[PDB]
Amino acid sequence: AHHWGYGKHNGPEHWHKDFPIAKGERQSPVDIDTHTAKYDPSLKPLSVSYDQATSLRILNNGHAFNVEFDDSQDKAVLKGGPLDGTYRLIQFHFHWGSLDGQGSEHTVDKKKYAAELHLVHWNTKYGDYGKAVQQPDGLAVLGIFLKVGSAKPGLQKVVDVLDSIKTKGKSADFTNFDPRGLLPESLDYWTYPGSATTPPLLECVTWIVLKEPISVSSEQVLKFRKLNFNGEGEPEELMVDNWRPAQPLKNRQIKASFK
Numbered sequence: 001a002h003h004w005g006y007g008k009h010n011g012p013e014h015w016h017k018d019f020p021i022a023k024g025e026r027q028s029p030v031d032i033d034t035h036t037a038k039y040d041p042s043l044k045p046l047s048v049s050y051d052q053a054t055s056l057r058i059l060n061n062g063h064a065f066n067v068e069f070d071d072s073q074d075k076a077v078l079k080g081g082p083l084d085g086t087y088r089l090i091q092f093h094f095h096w097g098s099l100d101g102q103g104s105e106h107t108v109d110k111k112k113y114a115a116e117l118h119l120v121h122w123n124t125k126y127g128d129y130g131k132a133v134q135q136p137d138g139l140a141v142l143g144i145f146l147k148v149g150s151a152k153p154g155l156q157k158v159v160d161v162l163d164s165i166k167t168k169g170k171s172a173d174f175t176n177f178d179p180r181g182l183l184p185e186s187l188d189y190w191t192y193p194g195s196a197t198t199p200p201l202l203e204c205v206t207w208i209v210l211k212e213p214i215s216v217s218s219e220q221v222l223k224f225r226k227l228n229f230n231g232e233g234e235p236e237e238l239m240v241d242n243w244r245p246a247q248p249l250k251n252r253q254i255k256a257s258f259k
């Protein structure tokens, strides 16, 4: 069974041994070189349609926490931008650091942010998530950087439930959460073809990374860092530094939606 993680002994440098696609041609995350990314006037504005989102549950899965949505019909969808068709929101989660100077997966001119939010969506033309991840255009992940400054009011409900899901395998009800409160003002973005950033690292993602970070407070991110990778009663390993470093860009172009 899976035994990968973020530690010295099972972290990103080890993943290729059980997931050889780790060394593939379209791995994520990557560094976004802002001077090399080309404005593409053919890209569209994103359409983020979360008005009818139905959050259900929050789960500590031993790698991050996922806020899960009802994806049994088109309630919260992502369309437009670089995408063809309709992508349904299934879950969001974050990656973060042990200190504010690292935590993001993507970097911008080598700058690491304190954390990165991933809103994960699957292409409805493949019928279910498991089928979608087997396709090069199966997922669309909306990535949003977090910097530390003022509090993000819409994040507080998430932070306040974390005490109840401290350890791997714990979940809690998480209904009526509006993910619109996690977005920045601008939907300007970069996009490129990549992969999931956790094993099995499937090369199925169209990445859409927002240029504008959101601000969260130090206190909010400190609460992320109180979670545990371990299960209940096991030796405590704080859930920190659950980010994969930037991978080689190889034969890919990062496109900008903005001039």
Ligand SMILES: NS(=O)(=O)c1nccs1
Binding pocket: 002, 003, 004, 005, 009, 010, 011, 014, 015, 016, 017, 018, 019
């Ligand atoms: N990250 S991994 O699953 O390939 C692994 N490395 C050592 C033991 S298990």
Ligand SMILES: NS(=O)(=O)c1nccs1
Binding pocket: 118, 120, 141, 195, 196, 197, 198, 205
């Ligand atoms: N961290 S991520 O959003 O690229 C992801 N991995 C698996 C499903 S979604």
Ligand SMILES: [Zn+2]
Binding pocket: 093, 094, 095, 118, 197
């Ligand atoms: Zn992620």
